[PDB]
Design a protein around this ligand. Structure first.
Ligand SMILES: Nc1ncnc2c1ncn2[C@@H]1O[C@H](COP(=O)(O)OP(=O)(O)NP(=O)(O)O)[C@@H](O)[C@H]1O
Ligand SMILES: Nc1ncnc2c1ncn2[C@@H]1O[C@H](COP(=O)(O)OP(=O)(O)NP(=O)(O)O)[C@@H](O)[C@H]1O
Ligand SMILES: [K+]
Ligand SMILES: [K+]
Ligand SMILES: [Mg+2]
Ligand SMILES: [Mg+2]
Lengths: 333, 333
């Protein structure tokens, strides 16, 4: 009771939020690329320097941000993705909290440059100070947006201590991009580190062959054991691949990617169903390898559970579990 | 780009935050009791009705809230617990985000009644509407505070669907209270459900015997196999009990409570160390039973990682793991 109850200073409030959303450089990459995706980008270029502790640049050919909404793009609780509870309960976009940019801006030097198709002029914006005041200035930029995040955690010393080696931090970025590249086969993605191109994922055209990117991302070993899945029932749909348990190695088991309505996830229920189907098919149990996609009515799933959207809750839990279990078991036979 | 980037309405913004902090009735109980603890309460009475979906009342004999800070107590990002980054990096209280009450108020009918020792008058406050406007009115109340949370999720229909049976929801509350009761032996805690007293934890006096409450909470079976631990090294300290692995059953293994600086936790590293020590001691591995407390310098741990403080990150990770491993292994021999 000694200290008065007081509203937290803008920057500090955002830094507390950043602790929950921004774990490491890879987290920044995840939030910004999901923004590019929501913006309708079909090409995304990611440039990283020193594992992301020095620089993280993401350029996309999305629709861009209007000049007079740049300050709003950096403001807390400000979003163009939802505007009501109904919008929230039926999420059709990766973002919805309106917090990512504000959180990241508070623990780094973040610059936003963008131009919409209706603008002849491009603009650049950034927030500063304890009050996070925004500056908007003239810039040169094509239709689309570029995010520049420099000196991550420069103003939050303690957090910077958790940063691993640059090789390690970059590996997590590479892994994040991997997961994203598998979520959207139709998006061209380029990734570089310290001025050197490391990844070049090419968009899979209309009804094109996805096996090409699948193998390029997960590996030929996976592609060889990959069993395509096509299971549906009403609004419930299951797609993707699952390796033959009998021919799955510890290495292949490192590939356990699942998506819910296109959003990368790591759900316990989903993993259990897949594991149960493989154990019941194979003699015993042993980490399965897979890249599965679950499509479900937005109203049947709650994605407002973790600040980084790391988890979800299914209304008809038992129904969903059984659906996936049956789907995988059906392909294994 | 069709919808404008717009700041979210106060209530909706809070509801999004509530989705991340308020999972179920037990979550509400957790946040409010931690508030009572931070306020210096030595006695806390918890009354629950219909699993918490109907009512959740928490009364404490803490220091209370001053009249002119009641509105602030319900406001977003407002706290008396920290006021700077230094405060954040050295957390010495359970709360620090300044969001719990605002989040809960947005998805329920929350009433706050309180009086400080310096006040002859008591006051009651609550927020309403899309803008969460606060009303403060006269009330009768002793020194301390009472929180009343009625009709949880009445205005967020979808979320209310996830509520389980009242017996189940209450069981989670009972479990939460269990974890809290073990964190603070010096606090008297009473818990009732539908007007019927269910739990009566009595405070353990100065240097009193903690075995009494330990057995009352965890059970005589645990108490019989419980091996006291006293391991220290600098600012690092390990206290509590660990059951003999050779005499631990699946039932006893349900007791895996760990605390970090008094805060209930469920850390992977901690659990691994304890499990590693037991496996290396016993012939094979098998879920250990324990109630352990880790005391560490606030600067060596990051508790600003999850909105509900469900996780932490240790700076010198390997050091901590080894400390716990050695501590437990030392007692097992
Ligand atoms: N690359 C981009 N292209 C176009 N608009 C963007 C881009 N990045 C961000 N925005 C806009 O900026 C707003 C702010 O982004 P952000 O702070 O990430 O919040 P969000 O995406 O709405 N929700 P969240 O991620 O859940 O916090 C979005 O709602 C978009 O309208
Ligand atoms: N039972 C109580 N007795 C005295 N003060 C209280 C009590 N409950 C809440 N408060 C006060 O109300 C403020 C608001 O509470 P709350 O919204 O829970 O935020 P917090 O405890 O500061 N942080 P957080 O829990 O991390 O969101 C606290 O900072 C206290 O100053
Ligand atoms: K924003
Ligand atoms: K508050
Ligand atoms: Mg976003
Ligand atoms: Mg609190």
């Amino acid at each position: 009771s000694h200290m008065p109850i007081q509203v937290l200073p803008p920057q500090l409030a955002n830094q507390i939020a950043a602790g929950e959303v921004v774990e490491r450089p890879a987290s920044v990459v995840k939030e910004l690329v999901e923004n590019s995706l929501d913006a309708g980008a079909t090409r995304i270029d990611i440039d990283i320097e020193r594992g992301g502790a020095k620089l993280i640049r993401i350029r996309d050919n999305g629709c861009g941000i209007k000049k007079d909404e740049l300050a709003l793009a950096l403001a807390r609780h400000a979003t163009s993705k939802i505007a009501s509870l109904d919008d929230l309960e039926a999420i059709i976009s990766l973002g919805f909290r309106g917090e990512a940019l504000a959180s990241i801006s508070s623990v780094s030097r973040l610059t936003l440059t963008s131009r919409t198709a209706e603008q002849q002029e491009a603009w650049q914006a950034y927030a500063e100070g304890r009050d996070m005041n925004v500056t908007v200035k003239p810039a040169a930029h094509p239709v689309g947006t570029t995010l520049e995040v420099l000196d991550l955690f420069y103003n939050t010393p303690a957090r910077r201590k958790f940063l691993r080696t640059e090789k390690t931090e970059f590996n997590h970025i590479d892994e994040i991009i991997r997961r994203i590249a598998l979520a959207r086969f139709d998006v061209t993605i380029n990734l570089s580190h310290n001025g050197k191109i490391v990844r070049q994922y090419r968009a899979v055209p209309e009804g094109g062959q996805k096996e090409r990117r699948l193998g390029a991302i997960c590996g030929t070993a996976f592609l060889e054991q990959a069993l395509a899945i096509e299971w549906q029932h009403g609004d419930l749909t299951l797609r993707g691949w699952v390796a033959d348990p009998n021919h799955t190695t510890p290495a292949l088991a490192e590939i356990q990617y699942c998506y819910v309505n296109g959003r990368m996830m790591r759900d316990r229920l989903i993993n259990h169903a897949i594991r149960q189907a493989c154990e019941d098919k194979l003699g015993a149990d042993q980490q399965p390898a897979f890249v599965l996609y679950l499509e479900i009515d937005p109203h049947q799933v709650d994605v407002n559970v973790h600040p980084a959207k790391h988890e979800v809750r299914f209304h008809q839990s038992r129904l969903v579990h059984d659906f996936i279990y049956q789907g995988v078991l059906s392909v294994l036979q």
